[PDB]
Design a protein around this ligand. Sequence first.
Ligand SMILES: Nc1nc2c(ncn2[C@@H]2O[C@H](COP(=O)(O)O)[C@@H](O)[C@H]2O)c(=O)[nH]1
Ligand SMILES: Nc1nc2c(ncn2[C@@H]2O[C@H](COP(=O)(O)O)[C@@H](O)[C@H]2O)c(=O)[nH]1
Lengths: 152, 152
Amino acid sequence: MRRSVYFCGSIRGGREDQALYARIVSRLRRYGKVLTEHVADAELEPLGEEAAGGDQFIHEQALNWLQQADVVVAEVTQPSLGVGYELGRAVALGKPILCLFRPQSGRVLSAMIRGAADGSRFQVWDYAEGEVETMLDRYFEAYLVEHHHHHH
Amino acid sequence: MRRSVYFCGSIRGGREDQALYARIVSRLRRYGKVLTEHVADAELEPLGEEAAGGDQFIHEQALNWLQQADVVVAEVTQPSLGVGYELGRAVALGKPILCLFRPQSGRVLSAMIRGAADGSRFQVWDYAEGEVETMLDRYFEAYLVEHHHHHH
Ligand SMILES: Nc1nc2c(ncn2[C@@H]2O[C@H](COP(=O)(O)O)[C@@H](O)[C@H]2O)c(=O)[nH]1
Ligand SMILES: Nc1nc2c(ncn2[C@@H]2O[C@H](COP(=O)(O)O)[C@@H](O)[C@H]2O)c(=O)[nH]1
């Protein structure tokens, strides 16, 4: 009834991912529902439990969003440890995962990542800078035309 | 009845992880059962299905081993994308996870990784080169003395 897409992008406390997150959030919300909202909130909602929350909460928030997230999509030009972990949980929790790696960033996907992309429900596309939009448009266009993730 | 510990280490087709894998395999097997055997086999068992197997098989082999692996232990000095993915699956599939990061390697654990270590069943210890043995000895000694992973 309701589709939810979770975006996975390494921020590392950077201000170069927020711009991408704001633009990707609007595109993901247009289809059904978009998560990864924490990386775009200029008003940390106060009140609640008076404890030392932070990193532990970060992991808990991502776990709760993936529960509803019917599909996961990632956009990282370099091998991110934190983002890689999220991808692993997405495959174990969900099924249809997406990965966007820049084929001209300099780095490369390790054996574990390459192996993960069996072709069933996990697809790893290569986007070269200005090609990120093409990959996102093709991913959303191919998803609507297929109406599922069964084809290899 | 039978305990199985799966070791997680970034190899990236390198010959610097095999030496560590051989020494860690013996220590892990001494306690109960050790996996990550693929990274130490000089005799690829032939025969079987005649297909293009490789990366997909790598991911499938790790998934099958974690099923029996009651506990997971990792030893990486730098943020590894492939290894990070395995850790995510270990927390989603199992529960008691271990992480060994070098506090003098140069890099650092991202927000996702730090958050993952809630202190419940996931413990991230810092080992400085020659301190890898100390972390492994304390991890195995603390596991036998506690007889479980409940303490925070
Ligand atoms: N749900 C959720 N995800 C988070 C939070 N903090 C970081 N993340 C996710 O963790 C990733 C960033 O990992 P890092 O850049 O630190 O390696 C991104 O995919 C981002 O969405 C948080 O508080 N909640
Ligand atoms: N079970 C299993 N694990 C593998 C295989 N190939 C690589 N790995 C695991 O993947 C990790 C290496 O990832 P990478 O160094 O390529 O980032 C190690 O933890 C290693 O045990 C394989 O064929 N089978």
